[PDB]
């Protein structure tokens, strides 16, 4: 996350971190329930075998509230391709159930029509992750969050050198130096409504980070609610 | 405006049935007696920051 602020105690409980064999986070995720994590399909290439850590806010040491969960089943959308980055979504079923506590809680999945009419029409959303804090740099050891304005669909299509499909939406700033960055992929994009946070997107991609005239691209969760539901069953 | 007028006074989901507002909640929540508020069923309902 470029810019933004540190996620303070209990502010981003639905954040999940995918860790490789070296116990280093390479992508984020969103806790949906005790057994399921939502993330980006393109992350399932960043590492072969991986696990999921929840309740972490500081990568340096171990507070005692963190918990590691092995993945039982990986469900990646069969239509994802690096050529288009379309259908950038995946669901993970964990071997053991997550125990909710301070800094560990699921984000709500909204209904399609309501989310589109009421959530995605709000002024802003929140993105978070342990990603880079500058285009060139190491991953952040601290979990960060950033309020990102929803961006007009026509405006973002124009500003993009890549096709923005109906499974994607844009959020961020035109010139203000704040945006998601490498490593934040798969992380949550949530929208607050009456103090309740609903997952509305998955950190997907962007042409550079916080680049002037460029916005952040996110997978539109509302376009895959039925796909997600089917995944949390099989 | 029904659902378009302040989300029909619903805490969460708002639908229009028979040209009337009908509120509903995410899993883990129960619709309150007033048919508008959503009451959590456990200590860690979805979408709530853990600030306590
Ligand atoms: N705001 C950025 C961001 C947010 C979230 C996660 C990662 C990034 N970064 N971070 C970096 C940096 F740091 F600069 F190296 C680079 C990226 C990034 O997404 N590049 C990228 C840029 C474009 C595409 C893309 C889209 C559609 C079709 C094909 C492609 S394609 N693949 O070109 O054929 C995919 C990417 F992956
Ligand atoms: Ca820690």
DSSP A71-113: EEEEEE-TT--TTT-TT--EEEEESSPPPPBTTB-PPBPPPHH
- Let me know if domain A1-12+107-222 sits in CATH 2.40.10.10: yes
**A147 CB-near residues (< 8 Å, 6+ apart):** A4, A124, A125, A126
E strand or H helix at A46: none
Q: How far is A63 from chain B, CA to nearest CA, in Å?
A: 16
- The length of chain B, given as a count of residues: 52
Distance CA A44, CA A48 (A): 7
Catalytic-residue membership of A88: yes
Distance CA A43, CA A59 (A): 19
- CB-CB contact of A130 with A186 (8 Å): no
- Distance (angstroms) between ligand 1 centre and the Cα of A205 equals 4
Distance CA A104, CA A71 (A): 17
Catalytic-residue membership of A185: yes
| A215 closest CA partner among A161, A166, A167 | A161
**A171 CB-near residues (< 8 Å, 6+ apart):** A124, A125, A127, A148, A149, A150, A151, A189, A201, A215, A216, A218
Distance CA A198, CA B12 (A): 10
What resolution in angstroms does the PDB record give?
1.9
| Placement of tokens 């002037």 in the chain | A212
Neighbours of A211 (CB within 10 A): 17
- Distance (angstroms) between ligand 2 centre and the Cα of A104 equals 13
Residue span of the structural domain in which B41 resides: 1-52
Atom of ligand 1 nearest to the CA of A209: 1
DSSP single-letter state for residue A200: E
E strand or H helix at B31: strand B29-31
- CB-CB contact of A110 with B10 (8 Å): no
- CB-CB contact of A12 with A27 (8 Å): no
Looking at the structure of chain B, the number of domains it has is 1
Q: Where are the domains of chain A?
A: 1-12+107-222, 13-106+223-234
| Placement of tokens 């285009």 in the chain | A135
Catalytic-residue membership of A189: no
Method: X-ray
Interchain CB distance below 8 Å, A196 and B12: yes
Q: CATH number of the domain at A13-106+223-234, please?
A: 2.40.10.10
B48 — contact with chain A (CB < 8 Å)?
A: yes
- The CATH number assigned to the domain holding B8 equals 2.10.25.10
Establish, for the pair of chains A and B, how many residue pairs have beta carbons separated by less than 8 Å. 70
Interchain CB distance below 8 Å, A10 and B49: yes
A95-118 burial code (b ≥16 CB/10 A, e <16): eeebebbebbbbbbbbbeebbeeb
Nearest CA in chain B to A195: B48
Atom of ligand 1 nearest to the CA of A214: 1
Structure tokens at A172: 């961020």
Selecting from B12, B27, B50 the residue whose C-beta is nearest the C-beta of A105 gives: B50
């Amino acid at each position: 996350i470029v810019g933004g602020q540190e996620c303070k105690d209990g502010e981003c409980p639905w954040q999940a971190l995918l860790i490789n064999e070296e116990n280093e986070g390479f992508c984020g995720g969103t806790i949906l329930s005790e057994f399921y994590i939502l993330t980006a399909a393109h992350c399932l290439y960043q590492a072969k075998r991986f696990k999921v850590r929840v309740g972490d806010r500081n990568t340096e040491q171990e507070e005692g509230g963190e918990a590691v969960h092995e993945v039982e089943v990986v469900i990646k959308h069969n239509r994802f391709t690096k050529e288009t980055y379309d259908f950038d979504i995946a669901v993970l079923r964990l071997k053991t159930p997550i125990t909710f506590r301070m800094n560990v809680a699921p984000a709500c999945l909204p209904e399609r029509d309501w989310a589109e009419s009421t959530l995605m029409t709000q002024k802003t959303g929140i993105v978070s992750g342990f990603g880079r804090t500058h285009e060139k740099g190491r991953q952040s050891t601290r979990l960060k969050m950033l309020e990102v304005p929803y961006v007009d669909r026509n405006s973002c299509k124009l500003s993009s050198s890549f096709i923005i499909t109906q499974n994607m939406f844009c959020a961020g700033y035109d010139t203000k130096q704040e945006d998601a960055c490498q490593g934040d992929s798969g992380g949550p994009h949530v929208t607050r409504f009456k103090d309740t946070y609903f997952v509305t997107g998955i950190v997907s991609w962007g042409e550079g980070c916080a680049r002037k005239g460029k916005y952040g691209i996110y997978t539109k969760v509302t376009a895959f609610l039925k796909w997600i539901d089917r995944s949390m069953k099989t | 405006k029904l659902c378009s007028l302040d989300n029909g006074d619903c805490d969460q989901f708002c639908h229009e049935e028979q040209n009337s507002v009908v509120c509903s909640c995410a899993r883990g929540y129960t619709l309150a007696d007033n048919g508008k508020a959503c009451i959590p069923t456990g200590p860690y309902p979805c979408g709530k920051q853990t600030l306590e």
